[PDB]
Design a protein around this ligand. Structure first.
Ligand code: HEM
Length: 373
């Protein structure tokens, strides 16, 4: 089963916490404390690997400047300003599924929602929604094979998709400068740090980064959360009788079934983890999914506990690169679960089809039997 790689994570935590793959010459780390240090110890583990124009591949001070500016678009105040809009979009998705006793949580809910949400939060007119989805699908696409002929064909089509989306965002930015609104692009136009503003050359890639970093991740979080709730008899009912536990259930879902299993860093200075020496220039794969299942870090790490509070997981990362969109992912996932708990008195898993992507843990299909309340 590709939806159950936890037994392997456990084998690697106890027999090879610090693993070196001779075929790829890249390190692997699986224990919570070591995964946490690799992703946060910036002085020794770097994000620069010579995505390229974005802060995800930057180290301080270049990262610090951009991070300090774009963070003004994800403040708690701004999130509350947008909570109503996310609820409307979620209600509209579920409304399209009224009068059915079987739905596919992915294709009918968890996959569409993030793309719809980020377009309305970015200020993209809703009248381009279907051409916005195509570009966003192209952005997160992967080649079917690793041979030159297949990657070359895929790269050329995503390149043209990224260029058209870039030109599309450049037009939205230009329009918002004259008619500013209540959206991310408008906020970043007027966002300023002692006179320092994001350039057009920086805003456009950043808006592509929001689609690339937020769409599938949030989709997988919602699907994995609903799956884990229905995996434990009584949790669905328990959440509907104590709705204030939903945020804690969202965090537990990021710990239990991390949508982004692994994070990459490059060794910046010679150092050692757990006694294993690592040379400058080597790649380290930090397995967040395994860190969040570490029994040395969490009590009953193999069980889904919606009462765990506070949750010290690192599914959103840790350090200066801590997920910029975590406030939005948390709010979106909370609202999605509330909308399901209110529309359905009961849900039952019929069949699941997991996503077999390396750098993503989620489901491509999640067919359910539902009962409207
Ligand atoms: C369940 C949903 C999500 C998960 C698990 C997640 C996870 C992560 C993680 C682990 C990182 C750190 C990567 C690294 O340190 O190299 C990260 C970075 C980032 N994420 Fe998220 N993310 C989620 C949703 C979102 C959303 C909804 C957005 C935006 C709309 C977003 C935008 C970003 C950005 C911009 C960064 C780069 C931060 C930086 O480099 O300073 N993510 N995400």
């Amino acid at each position: 089963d590709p939806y159950d790689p936890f037994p392997w994570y456990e084998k690697m935590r106890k027999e090879s916490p610090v693993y070196y793959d001779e075929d790829s010459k890249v390190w692997s780390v699986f224990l919570y404390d070591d995964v946490k240090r690799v992703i946060s110890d910036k002085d020794f583990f770097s994000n620069q690997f010579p995505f390229a124009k974005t802060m995800v591949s930057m180290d301080p001070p270049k990262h610090t400047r951009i991070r300090s500016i774009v963070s003004k678009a994800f403040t708690p105040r701004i999130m509350k300003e947008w909570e109503p809009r996310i609820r409307v979009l979620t209600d509209e998705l579920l409304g399209k599924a009224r009068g059915r006793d079987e739905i596919d949580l992915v294709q009918d809910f968890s996959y569409p929602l993030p793309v719809m949400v980020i377009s309305e939060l970015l200020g993209v007119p809703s009248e381009h929604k279907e051409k916005f989805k195509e570009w966003s699908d192209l952005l997160v696409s992967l080649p079917k094979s690793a041979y030159e002929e297949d990657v070359m064909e895929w790269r050329t089509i995503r390149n043209k998709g990224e260029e058209d989306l870039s030109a599309f965002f450049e037009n939205v930015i230009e329009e918002k400068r004259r008619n500013l609104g209540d959206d991310i692009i408008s906020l970043l136009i007027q966002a300023e740090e002692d006179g320092d503003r994001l350039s057009p050359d920086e805003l456009v890639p950043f808006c592509n980064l929001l689609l690339l970093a937020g769409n599938e991740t949030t989709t997988n979080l919602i699907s994995n959360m609903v799956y884990s709730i229905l995996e434990k008899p009584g949790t669905f009912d328990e959440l509907a009788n104590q709705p204030d536990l939903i945020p804690q259930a969202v965090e537990e879902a990021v710990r239990f079934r991390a949508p982004a299993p692994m994070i990459v860093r490059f060794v910046q200075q010679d150092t050692a983890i757990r006694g294993v020496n690592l040379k400058k220039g080597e790649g380290v794969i930090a397995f967040l999914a395994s860190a969040n299942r570490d029994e040395a870090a969490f009590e009953r790490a193999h069980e889904f506990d919606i009462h765990r509070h506070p949750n010290r997981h690192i599914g959103f990362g840790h350090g200066i690169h801590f997920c910029l969109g975590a406030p939005l992912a948390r709010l979106e996932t909370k609202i999605a679960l509330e909308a399901l708990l209110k529309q359905y008195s009961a849900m039952e898993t019929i069949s699941t089809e997991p996503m077999a992507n390396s750098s993503m843990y989620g489901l491509k299909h999640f067919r359910l039997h539902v009962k409207e309340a």
